[PDB]
Design a protein around this ligand. Structure first.
Ligand SMILES: CC(C)C[C@@H](N)C(=O)O
Lengths: 324, 323
């Protein structure tokens, strides 16, 4: 009697979900729904099933994990899947979450299913800690930094600069800003003080390195506001040391108690593989959604509504005995 | 609007009183002391003798037990829970299963809800231990205790012979902390994570100080740690060791299929441990108030409470601001 999981999208995240499931004995992978012609994408990968056949699994999948491979799926179609299954997604457009919730709630609701939106680390785990922090320390500041990680957008930008063969960009929290937050001295940070950007560029033969550097550093919207460093490297080093699959970040609540005493709470992640971690979180929440659906819960939910006890396959007593 | 009653007025109780002031949606109804009426009327303030607890029925939504004493809670807890929704910070991990059972039985009878073992540990750290092993099933969880007093160990020493008053500190080892943070995965011994430093005021007859080294051999308390010992005057203990600060770390180091290193960390750096613990109790009282109005009865732990219940903001507001 294991939890039957369905995967939609076979990009890095779906690949990770399939992986995570192996680390979860109480779960089985029923199928991987893809758009690519399964016929040519091998056949020994017995779990692969074409997206056109999704509906045929309406009764064999307990939780459908949406790992949409960037397109219309990775934002629009989950609503179509919620109409048929209990789902879990990591919709990451913070500004549009209120709307995504509205829509998903209606569907999952009248369909009698349950849909979990925006889980992962941010949104997801960082969200939970932002809430915990301001809930426990009502008087204070909340600072979220996004650990060393790539920005697809900024990388494409770098590529539009004259004389740039190829390149990559990283956003990195500034240590000095972290140290001050970690100290109880409450304060607000300017954009320039929280994060710095680091680019590794492969120049064309003869290109005007100093020009490229400034073209990137003074680039409006993307870099103008941040201290940016440009390192020039070869195509070999680019491929070897900048796969760009890692990430991390910090959530810090710097506050004071009534008497004025300093109190600091911090939560952070260091991810060698950002995608595999997100997937692991997706799977864990799948366990929670399964329980919830069985309890007969309906509508859309966020990690903000789920007790941590639901993320574990252990019983209530085992937890209170082992972890409390 | 949430009417809070404080039971006990030590450091935590004082802390709850202050924290209530940081919550516009909450009101302090009274502070219950064990002190004899033989005080000074009430000395003004919100102080009320414990004997009058019964009288506040239907005028208190949540009783926050700031008694401070695991053993006292064993009996007093059920007592209160039979009359009010309660919130305590029962900190004896080893006996939490028993406390839950007792509090559960009672609270269900009276139709009330009792939240036990909240605080930073048990409480917040328990939450992260769970989150940690839930997201990274394959890995190792390590908990450290920042640098501060370890109350229990402070009494165990006060029970020693030639000692009449003393204090101890628990201190994480930078070396252990870094390894944990390296996603290297491994097992640590008690002696590898923390060292103990004691400060004791002896002399019950200038008593044998070297036999006071019967503290370093104390089973379950020291001996498992490199325990450094010092002796001082009780003036040098009040104006030098008002150990209010404390902190800790919960590190989950693990690997996802394929061996990629994944590290999660939660830590606290508290200038005033008690006050922090107090803010946690209040935040959770809000959650208990809500569950209460929803009709939940019986005992619960932080593991059963959705984080959204700790905030006075609405669900739509949280999704918009924090999600
Ligand atoms: C839209 C995202 C996939 C990439 C964007 N956050 C960026 O880094 O530009």
């Amino acid at each position: 009697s294991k939890i039957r999981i369905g995967i939609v999208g076979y990009g890095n995240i779906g690949k990770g979900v399939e992986k995570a499931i192996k680390q979860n004995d109480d779960m089985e992978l029923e199928a991987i729904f893809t758009r690519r012609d399964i016929n040519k994408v091998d056949s020994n990968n017995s779990k692969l099933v074409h997206i056109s056949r999704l509906e045929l699994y309406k009764d064999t999948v307990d939780v459908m994990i949406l790992c949409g491979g960037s397109a219309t799926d990775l934002v629009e179609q989950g609503p179509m899947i919620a109409s048929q299954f209990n789902t879990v997604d990591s919709f990451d457009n913070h500004g549009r979450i209120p709307q995504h919730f509205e829509r998903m709630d209606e569907i999952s609701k009248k369909a009698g299913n349950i849909s979990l939106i925006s889980t992962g680390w941010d949104p997801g785990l960082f969200s939970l800690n932002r809430l915990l922090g301001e809930s426990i320390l009502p008087k204070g500041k909340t600072h979220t930094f996004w650990g060393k990680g790539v920005s697809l957008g900024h990388s494409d930008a770098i590529r539009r600069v004259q004389g740039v063969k190829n390149g990559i960009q990283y956003i990195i929290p500034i240590k000095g800003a972290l140290d001050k937050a970690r100290s109880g001295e409450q304060c607000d940070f300017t954009t320039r003080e929280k994060h710095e950007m680091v680019c590794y560029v492969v120049p064309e033969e003869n290109a005007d390195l100093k020009k490229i550097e400034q073209d990137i550093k003074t680039m409006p919207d993307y870099f103008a506001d941040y201290n940016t460093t440009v390192h020039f490297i070869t195509e070999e080093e680019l491929k070897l040391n900048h796969a760009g699959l890692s990430n991390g970040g910090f959530v810090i609540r710097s506050g004071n108690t009534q008497g004025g005493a300093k109190q600091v709470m911090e939560f952070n992640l260091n991810l060698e593989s950002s995608a595999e971690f997100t997937s692991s979180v997706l799977v864990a929440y799948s366990r929670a959604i399964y329980k919830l659906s069985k309890e007969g819960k309906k509508g859309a939910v966020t990690v903000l509504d789920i007790p941590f006890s639901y993320l574990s396959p252990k019983t209530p007593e085992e937890l209170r005995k082992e972890l409390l």
